Design a protein around this nucleic acid. Sequence first.
RNA 1: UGUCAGUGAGAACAAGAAAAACGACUCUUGUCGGACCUACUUGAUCAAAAGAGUGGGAAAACCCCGGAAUCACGUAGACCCACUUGGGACCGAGUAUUGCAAUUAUUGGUCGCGCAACGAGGAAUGUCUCGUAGGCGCAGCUCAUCAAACUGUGCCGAUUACGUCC
Lengths: 140, 38, 70, 99, 119, 120
Amino acid sequence: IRRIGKKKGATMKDVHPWRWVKLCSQHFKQEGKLMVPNCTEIVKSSHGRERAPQNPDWYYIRCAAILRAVYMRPGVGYGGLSKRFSNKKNRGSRPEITVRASKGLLHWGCKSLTKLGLIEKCESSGHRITKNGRKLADAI
Amino acid sequence: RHCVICSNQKAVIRKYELNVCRQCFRENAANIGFSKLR
Amino acid sequence: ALQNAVVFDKETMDKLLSEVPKYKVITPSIISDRLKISVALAAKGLQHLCRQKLIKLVSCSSKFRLYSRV
Amino acid sequence: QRVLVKMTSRNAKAVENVMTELLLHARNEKVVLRGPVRLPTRTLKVTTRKTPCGNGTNTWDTYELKIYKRLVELRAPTELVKKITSFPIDAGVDVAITI
Amino acid sequence: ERTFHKFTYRGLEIDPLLALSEEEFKTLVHARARRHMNRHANRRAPVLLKRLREAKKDVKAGEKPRAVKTHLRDVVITPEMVGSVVGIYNGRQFNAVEIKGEMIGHYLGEFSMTYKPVI
Amino acid sequence: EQFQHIVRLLNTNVEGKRKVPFALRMVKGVGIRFAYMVCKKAGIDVERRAGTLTAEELERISEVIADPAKFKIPDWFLNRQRDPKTGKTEHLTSAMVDTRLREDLERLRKNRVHRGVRHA
RNA sequence: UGUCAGUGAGAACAAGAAAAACGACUCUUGUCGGACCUACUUGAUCAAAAGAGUGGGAAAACCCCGGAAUCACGUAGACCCACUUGGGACCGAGUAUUGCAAUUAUUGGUCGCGCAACGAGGAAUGUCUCGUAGGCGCAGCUCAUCAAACUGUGCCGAUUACGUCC
């Protein structure tokens, strides 16, 4: 492993591959974007970036944790049931992305459902995160 | 469900860990090896 | 000044530029405690002025940041 | 492969008479003896209302069992295992295994 | 004949509905109806279900077909043999006057009281 | 001149806000429908609703509301689906609410049993 | 509601405890696998609910035996001092799941109504001094099926007092 948490994985490993991936297309954009991504919304899926805060991160989780997928990988999914029926709030996940995200890894920086690196492209291209921000970073 | 050491089916059936001893209460009907110490 | 305001207007922005350096401590809150526009885009209003150096940023952070007269 | 002996019992001082004492017979005598330290001891906890009616202070109990699982290991006895498992007869719920 | 109804039920009048079978009916209608029909297919009662058709054949009344009562509140109202009138079970009430059209795919029960709310 | 301004959409004044979907809910909709917002030809948010027929192109939005089945957009967001006397109806708004209700206001409330009488 | 704060995203990270076996099939000179869970993949060239196949376990094996809430976050997110984008309770339409039988039983689901209540709430009154109070989540329990309940484990974790007897 190598990916995530070596550059600050929370907010300084995300925006940089995001820019690069939208600038030249790579990952899935399949219809289903509008549909509920996180439990019991009263709003739309998000204000902007419906399924473009997702894809590399959903590779990252499975990478460093070795073959967490489809039921384990929603482990680092979310759901609080933040609106509820006046009972004690409980955790959930929405399966929608699981299918698409186990498809993903066969292209771009990972190989297979057993081996999750190639040259580990994301790491190498993320070495310029530290050097210079692309967001006007506070710490750079 | 139903019980096998009564036929009452009411006054509550234990089926926890595959035993019934609450249609004949376990305080009265001990020697199952349980003890209370804490 | 006036109590309610979504608005983008000539007056809005022209007033803004004069009022911002007046205070010794500038936050998104106090600009909408003048009430000229809502707290919401009052935030953005300060950012892209501070970026052009009408203000001094204090915190290495945004949102719950504060600012000062430059 | 290597044969192991797990002895599962409700009570201590039944299993004790098995492991310590009667493994001496298999210690280097016919096979070699690798002692680890026995597996974690489960509790079976049950909670029973004391009162047989709805008027009390709504009291309850805590009843517990110990489950002692005593594991010691050997290095491949075959046909010798017959001796090993015929040794305890000293208490009920003494059960032994062979791989 | 001696049955009088109006449906207009998913755009379908009396004629198209009784042309369709119960099998094709449930593909249109309620989640409930599907499950009941599927698992009740083996036996729905021979003679009760018979008598609902039999009373239709009978004549010399303009009144809806009179048919033997039920103790069952669990039986569906089918598109076929509709307007067949039975005493819907309750321990005080039997109603022949809560069987009308626009009740297909709905239970025979959910009727004949069970409480009289007062005050 | 504007830039928070009342809007007639059911011939009913509803005041603007500085967010489009949130204000639009008063017209008989909700957020989760207005993921159609992206395809309503102003997917932008943090925008006035005095922006009607200028930067919102109101007429566009008012088509999506009425039939989203002309558009390709997923019809899992429909308010009514496969009614008991008709097919699907794409939305619930205005007088079109009342129509469906009345039919089942006589039927439903008949029901007798525990929960039946509670609904009655 | 501004002391999760309301809808969005991402990060790091927990502990007891539950589970399996039918004279039902097959197997022989005296007899083996199906009512438990979880893994993995199809379930997205197009939703959720939900379908099915492969794989392991009698548990320190169950895939890392243990994870997503309280929390962290300026990613320069969105809302922003309103009964709203704060809250749900009523109400109608659809569908799948469970079962010997459902009659909102189903409910982890869609999407309406929210502009229905209610703005810390008179008199009165409850109980705790430390890892406690308070806040938060998970499992067990009951058992066709449902936990705002009960029982147990864990997480975040104070203010005041340490006195008197009115």
